[PDB]
Structures are given as C-alpha cells and as structure tokens.
Design a protein around this ligand. Structure first.
Ligand SMILES: *C/C=C(C)/C=C/C=C(C)/C=C/C1=C(C)CCCC1(C)C
Length: 137
C-alpha cells in the first residue's frame, strides 16, 4: 500500500444526509457540504503508522494513528471519540469509533486506495454512508 500523497476531492455523496443523522441543522449542513466540495487530504504512511492532515479553506486537523492501536479523534460532527483502525485487505482499512461522553449514532470510517489510483473515504452514521473520492494532486 502507498496511501501517502496529497489528495484532492472529486466527488462527495450523501454528506448532508450523514450530517443530518448526526443532528446538524440545515443551514450548517449546506455550508458544510460547500466546504467539502474542495477539501484536501494529505497522508504520510510508513508501514502501519499514518499521519493524516485534513483541510478545508479555513480549518485544518491532524490525525495520527498506528493500525491496531487505540487513539483519540473527533466524530464528523465534532464529538471526541476513541478510535481503532484495522485492515480489511491490502489497501483498505476500517475505523470503529466510540464516544468519550454521552450517546449518539454509531459512527465509523473507511479508507481505500483503489487499483485505479483513487482514494475512497467512507464515513458512516448508523444506516447512512457518505462516500468521498479523491485523486492525487
Ligand atoms: C483517512 C481520512 C479521513 C479519516 C478523513 C476524515 C475527514 C473528515 C472527518 C472531514 C470532515 C468534514 C467536516 C466535518 C465538515 C467540512 C467538510 C469535511 C468533509 C472536511
């Protein structure tokens, strides 16, 4: 696997629906969808160690993890969670998230490097799956 790269989004599906399940009100969802339309993901991967920087026009966040080792991050709607990533195959990993406080929809994400060279992210809340596709810059 070489997930390392600078990735730029080309498609985002079901993102508003995801945010709706997570309780985000409609005006904010629309503004969030607009922010997603041009967002970028930078990945540095060394073996099972990942550094990820996710950025939009005005916000940037860093995710650092090793596969199989619990880490802390935030859900899509911004709630702190404990996360654990495992491989599903050579070039796809899945992350299960657990809220640090309170209750809510069951959330997760996946990251896949396709044979065609695209990066596919999925983000899930209960029954709703958002799929986003990126290409290398
Ligand atoms: C491996 C890549 C991952 C786990 C990417 C995660 C990206 C997000 C959680 C981005 C979420 C966004 C919002 C919460 C609002 C603005 C639009 C996004 C897509 C940048």
């Amino acid at each position: 696997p070489n997930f390392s790269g600078n990735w730029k989004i080309i498609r985002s599906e079901n993102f508003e629906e995801l945010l709706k399940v997570l309780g985000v009100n409609v005006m904010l969802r629309k503004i969030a969808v607009a922010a997603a339309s041009k967002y970028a993901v930078e990945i540095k991967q060394e073996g099972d160690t990942f550094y990820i920087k996710v950025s939009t026009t005005v916000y940037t966040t860093e995710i650092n993890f090793k596969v199989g080792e619990e880490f802390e991050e935030q859900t899509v709607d911004g709630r702190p969670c404990k996360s654990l990533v495992k491989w599903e195959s050579e070039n796809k990993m899945v992350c299960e998230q657990k809220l640090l406080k309170g209750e809510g929809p069951k959330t997760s994400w996946t990251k896949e490097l396709t044979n065609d060279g695209e990066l596919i992210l999925t983000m899930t809340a209960d029954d709703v799956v958002c799929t986003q596709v990126f290409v290398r810059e």
